[PDB]
Design a protein around this nucleic acid. Structure first.
Lengths: 127, 111, 197, 50, 96, 171, 106, 49
RNA sequence: AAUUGUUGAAAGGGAAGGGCAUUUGAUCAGACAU
RNA sequence: AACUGGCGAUGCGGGAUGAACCGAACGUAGAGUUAAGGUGCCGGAAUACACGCUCAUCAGACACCACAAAAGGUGUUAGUU
RNA sequence: CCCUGAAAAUGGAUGGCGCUCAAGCGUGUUACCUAUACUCUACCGUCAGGGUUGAUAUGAUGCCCUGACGAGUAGGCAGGCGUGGAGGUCAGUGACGAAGCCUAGACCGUAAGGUCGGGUCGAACGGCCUCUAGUGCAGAUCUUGGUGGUAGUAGCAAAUAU
RNA sequence: UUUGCUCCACACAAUAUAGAUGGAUACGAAUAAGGCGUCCUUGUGGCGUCGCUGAACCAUAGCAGGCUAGCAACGGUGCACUUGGCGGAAAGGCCUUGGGUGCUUGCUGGCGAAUUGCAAUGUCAUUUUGCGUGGGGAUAAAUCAUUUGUAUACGACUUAGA
């Protein structure tokens, strides 16, 4: 029960990994553009890891939309869950990670009453 | 360059398929006669066939008509260039130079 | 089109036969080449012997067991000529070369089957008459093949047995042709003639 | 994990019984329709007429 | 050249049967039991094998062993070796 | 290049000093009209003091052969620039048309002297109709009375990669 | 009958490739019958199946099929181009392929 | 640079590799070329040095 | 974290690692259920 | 040193291989046509068609490029006088 | 065209196989193969030219239309992501478990990174508008600290002998 | 060595497949020559015919190939047996006898198909293993340790010990 949207096309996947992150443990996997002179990644040689460019940008109509067709909106309590009463088919509530279970039960009850979709209803549930 | 003298058929097909204007420094497509009348109504060029006429018969406002026409972006010739190596003069068995009457086939293939 | 295609090696040119067989093998056809001792190479015997001697001269300096292995049997010579044509260093090439068997003479598993020839790779079709050519068996026994005579004697025995079989086949085929001839001119044969049979 | 319409079976029995007489006017059409088509070795569908 | 078949004698001496074991002292010494039993019923299989050798045998070699017990050597395990017969045709060699 | 023979008439550009100039005509064997005109201007440039920027082509018309079926013996005179110097040659070719004769001349000259089209001048191709005007044995050989020769050792192109019987080359 | 085949047999040759770069999206199929692009032009719209077997039984069978279609002719030897829903595995070069007659035009 | 003074190579290169024998009894690699005229006889014997 | 042990999975004919594409195995979200 | 174009700062197809050469300069994708270069096999593409030459007991095989000369041959072919 | 002239050192290179009415040389005509090139389309971004006051789901820095373009070291500028700390705010999260840490489990962004589930854990921490800086590491024979293959290896053999 | 091992038949399950989906259909030799039929004086003979591609030949109709009736022949074919040979180059196959049984679309009939819904490989092959069935069949070595020296750095090698 979400807003109709065109096909979600991801121009790229396989998260851009830092060069030599596989080779060296000190090199983290977060992307960093190579600044070296004789670098086969800065000079886009054939057979090397692709670099993030603006051309990979997702469609402005399908941007930020989850596969369910909503945009995830963080909620910390019922007061900010109520911000999605009139936008049920565009925004989906996502309970924050630091919310206690005895508050998440209340949040889930209120959201199911209001029709708001919660993307993480199985959080800290002691069932 | 490869250049020749195009026939009326080549000119008409070019203007109909890849005819683009130069309205307000923007390359708009020659979709309706209204677009041509808006800009070239000063010179009497009222229709796309008016434009084709002022092109084929070099007329009083040929400079203006041809300038209004945007540089045609032609594809590669279907079926190749008919030659193993382009960069020799057409007289020398190549592709460039004054092909004269043979330009029609090349332009139709490249359209 | 059959699962295993047996190629009669006699009269064929090594390079062209190998170039055909490599493409077929990569295409997936299982190929068994027989009669490798009577393959043909263009050029005269001394020229081809000099080429093979120049090939023999090339070996690893510091350890000859690591160098090129100069196989001398005709089957292995043709197999080397084909492995040079097939990209053998990859799994695709290894599967292709696994799909291939090369023999000298005709072994018992394949002497009862139908041997085909490749017209694009035949000496009598590709070489202009008057051009000198070599027999792979002669070249091999010159450069050190130890089994020319023990293969020739087995070829003699195989050809003798095959002649005994072919006499019976020819007799039975003549009987079949005669019997089919009597059934010709009949109603069903006349009806088949209009349809092409 | 676990019948035919009677109307449908009667229409089939009348259409096929009306068509069988037309079939019988030619020698081998009934046997031909009983047979099932199948490409044989060496068949060229680009050159096989139908 | 490839060996086709070997036909052994009915009775093998202990010093040559030792060649077929590494632990003769505790072995059951079963070598050639079900083969010396094949010489029973006038050795039909043995003569058939010899006939096949005559039919297809280009070179004939004989397995022999030394009576090493006659030597002063301490080793009682004899040596077995193939010596080629040079002489008449294959039938003569195998008959010999 | 499957040449077509063109006959091209041109002249100098008329002026008030001497209007109505002298028409000059040439026969050029070329692949098409463009190359025909280019060769015409080349030859006029090397013959008289006139270049295309100073003259004009009044006409260019293709010549088709009078009898494209009757087999003739053309005698051709041709000069060419070898790797060291220029030589004049006479060769005769037995063919069917002037354009075919010029084409086989070009192939033959390229094959026997490595002379590309850029370094060959066709001096003159003229049909010789009387026999015994023939002087090259490779053409005198085919004028024999009641000529018949065989074609031994025929090899058939195979439409399939495998032939199932060992072929014979009879004929 | 003993033959139930309703498809033309074919061999999966290779992906479309330059000298040193291969495009896995477009494969090449050599049909056993065709020997020229003129004859290959008949099979352009035909559906193609690569039929393989796996040890795990899913959706009722251990036989799985990757579908595709002929797209256009390739070369002068009757080879055809093929586009599949999921590109054929590179392990299936020289593997067998069923080119069905549907959709048909006769 | 070339070897200043020539000298024959040490050892024989046709006896390589200088590893141990496969077994304590050396194999008779070759046998006399058989002819079918003389009577049947052995072409070797075993002894102990 | 480097580094190490056991268990589990997988691969391994003189490196390992990587990119594109898919087969295979394992694993997983969403949606019809509205 | 002069002019221009490049490489440096530049990846891509080709020249097997290479900073400079040939084609061509780049957002991410899909389809179509080509450039340079190629179509026996490795290798995707005609063991195409056509006319001739060459047999080397060190052939020849593609520009920059990974060389060959003066002088000779009754090897052979086409020519001139 | 071919041959002699033509001699260099590890084994060896028309790229290799191999090729002889060629898969060689000279030439001609077609067909065909494919680049991040060309043509058309979609999308991302940039630039430029424009439309939009109507109360406004607000915000004119918003929404929308049209066209072209997109390589790049040194360098310049812009828009952003992240960290310690400060003012304001969310009467924010939290012993019913904050922070941290592990997580070939999930989602979002082209990316910097952001969010969620699971385990461990025990007491503080975050979103936004701004302010401030001792604010972002792969290198510096970097500093300190810790740990590897080498490797159960070199070796533990002078001075008489147990 | 206490029901371990091998083989035979089917039964289930697992296991994968370099890739069944009518048949790999057997002279030899030359190509400026052969194949086949035929005749005789048997020859390097005569005569005739064929090639110009396997586009062939064989097989091919039935529930993925059902149940039934008859006609005409005494054939063709599968299967399990049986008889006798040939084959050692990687023989592991090729022929052959006899009857039994099954089918026979060589020819004429009778009944069934539906509904997998307009297609979805719509699953029919063989490769290995394991456990069961019930039926046979056969009842050892090697190594450590000790020992010798024809050997040896240690492994290894060569010996001997109920």
């Amino acid at each position: 029960a979400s807003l109709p949207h065109p096909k979600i096309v991801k121009k790229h996947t396989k998260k851009f990994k830092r060069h030599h992150s596989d080779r060296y443990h000190r090199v983290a996997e977060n992307w960093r553009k190579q600044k070296g002179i004789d670098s086969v990644v800065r000079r886009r040689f054939r057979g090397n890891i692709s670099q993030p460019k603006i051309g990979y940008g997702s469609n402005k109509k399908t941007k930020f939309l989850s596969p369910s067709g909503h945009k995830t909106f963080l909620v910390a309590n019922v007061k900010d869950l109520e911000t999605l009463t009139m936008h049920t088919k565009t925004y989906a509530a996502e309970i924050a990670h630091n919310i206690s279970a005895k508050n998440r039960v209340v949040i889930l009850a209120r959201a199911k009453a209001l029709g708001i979709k919660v993307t993480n209803p199985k959080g800290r549930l002691a069932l | 360059v490869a250049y020749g003298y195009p026939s009326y058929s080549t000119i008409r097909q070019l203007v109909y398929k890849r005819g683009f204007g130069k309205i307000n420094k923007q390359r708009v497509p020659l979709s309706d006669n209204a677009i041509i009348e808006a800009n070239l109504g000063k010179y009497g060029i009222l229709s796309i066939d008016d434009l084709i006429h002022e092109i084929i018969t070099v007329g009083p406002h040929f400079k203006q008509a041809n300038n209004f026409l945007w540089p045609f972006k032609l594809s590669n010739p279907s079926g190749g260039w008919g030659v193993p190596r382009k960069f020799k003069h057409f007289i020398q068995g190549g592709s460039f130079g004054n092909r004269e009457e043979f330009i029609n086939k090349l332009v139709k293939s490249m359209n | 089109v059959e699962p295993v295609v047996v190629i009669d090696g006699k009269g064929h040119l090594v390079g062209r036969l190998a170039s055909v067989v490599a493409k077929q093998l990569l295409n997936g056809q299982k190929i068994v080449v027989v009669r490798a001792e009577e393959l043909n190479i263009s050029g005269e015997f001394f020229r081809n012997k000099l080429k093979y001697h120049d090939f023999l001269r090339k070996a690893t300096a510091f350890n000859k067991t690591r160098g090129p292995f100069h196989f001398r049997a005709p089957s292995r010579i043709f197999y080397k000529a084909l492995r040079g044509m097939v990209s053998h260093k990859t799994a695709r090439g290894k599967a292709a070369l696994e799909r291939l068997k090369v023999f000298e003479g005709i072994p018992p598993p394949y002497d009862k089957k139908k041997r085909v020839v490749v017209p694009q790779a035949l000496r009598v079709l590709r070489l202009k008459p008057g051009r000198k050519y070599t027999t792979l068996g002669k070249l091999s026994t010159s450069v050190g093949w130890k089994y020319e005579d023990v293969v020739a004697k087995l070829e003699a025995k195989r050809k003798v047995s095959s002649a005994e079989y072919y006499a019976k086949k020819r007799a039975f085929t003549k009987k079949v042709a005669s019997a089919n001839a009597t059934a010709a001119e009949s109603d069903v044969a006349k009806q088949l003639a209009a349809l092409g049979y | 994990a676990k019948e035919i319409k009677t109307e449908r079976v009667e229409d089939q029995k009348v259409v096929d019984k009306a068509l069988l007489a037309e079939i019988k006017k030619t020698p081998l059409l009934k046997q031909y329709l009983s047979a099932s088509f199948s490409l044989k070795n060496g068949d060229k569908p680009h050159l096989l007429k139908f | 050249l490839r060996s086709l078949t070997t036909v052994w004698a009915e009775h093998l001496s202990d010093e040559v049967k030792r060649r077929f074991y590494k632990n003769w002292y505790k072995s059951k010494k079963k070598a050639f039991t079900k083969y010396s039993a094949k010489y029973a019923q006038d050795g039909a299989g043995i003569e058939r094998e010899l006939a096949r050798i005559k039919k297809y045998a280009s070179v004939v070699r004989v397995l022999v062993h030394t009576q090493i017990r006659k030597t002063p050597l301490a080793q009682k395990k004899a040596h077995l070796a193939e010596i080629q017969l040079n002489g008449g045709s294959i039938s003569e060699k195998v008959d010999w | 290049a499957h040449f077509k023979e063109y006959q091209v008439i041109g002249r100098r550009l008329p002026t008030e000093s001497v209007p109505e100039p002298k028409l000059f005509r040439m026969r050029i064997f070329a692949s098409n009209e463009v190359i025909a005109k280019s060769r015409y201007w080349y030859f006029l440039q090397k013959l008289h003091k006139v270049k295309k920027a100073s003259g004009e082509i009044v006409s260019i018309n293709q010549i088709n052969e009078a009898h494209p079926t009757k087999v003739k013996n053309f005698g051709v005179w041709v000069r060419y620039d070898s790797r060291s110097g220029t030589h004049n040659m006479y060769k005769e070719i037995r063919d069917v048309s002037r354009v075919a004769a010029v084409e086989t001349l070009y192939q033959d000259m390229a094959a026997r002297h490595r002379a590309r089209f850029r370094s060959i001048h066709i001096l003159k191709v003229a049909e010789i109709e009387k026999t015994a005007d023939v002087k090259r044995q490779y053409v005198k050989q085919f004028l024999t009375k009641d000529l018949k020769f065989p074609l031994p050792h025929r090899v058939q192109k195979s439409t399939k990669t495998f032939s199932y019987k060992r072929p014979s080359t009879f004929y | 009958a003993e033959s139930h085949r309703l498809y033309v047999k074919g061999k999966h040759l290779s992906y479309q490739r330059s000298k040193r770069v291969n495009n896995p999206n477009v494969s090449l199929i050599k049909i056993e019958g065709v020997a020229t692009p003129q004859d290959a032009q008949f099979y352009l719209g035909k559906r193609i199946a690569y039929v393989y077997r796996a040890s795990k039984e899913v959706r009722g069978s251990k036989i799985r099929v990757m579908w595709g279609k002929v797209t256009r002719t390739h070369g002068n030897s009757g080879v055809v181009r093929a586009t599949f829903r999921n590109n054929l595995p590179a392990k299936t070069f020289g593997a067998s392929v069923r080119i069905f007659l549907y959709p048909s035009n006769i | 640079s070339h070897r200043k003074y020539e000298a024959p190579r040490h050892g024989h290169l046709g006896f390589l590799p200088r590893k141990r024998a496969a077994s304590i009894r050396a194999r008779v690699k070759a046998f006399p070329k058989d002819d079918r005229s003389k009577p049947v006889a052995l072409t070797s014997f075993l002894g102990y040095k």
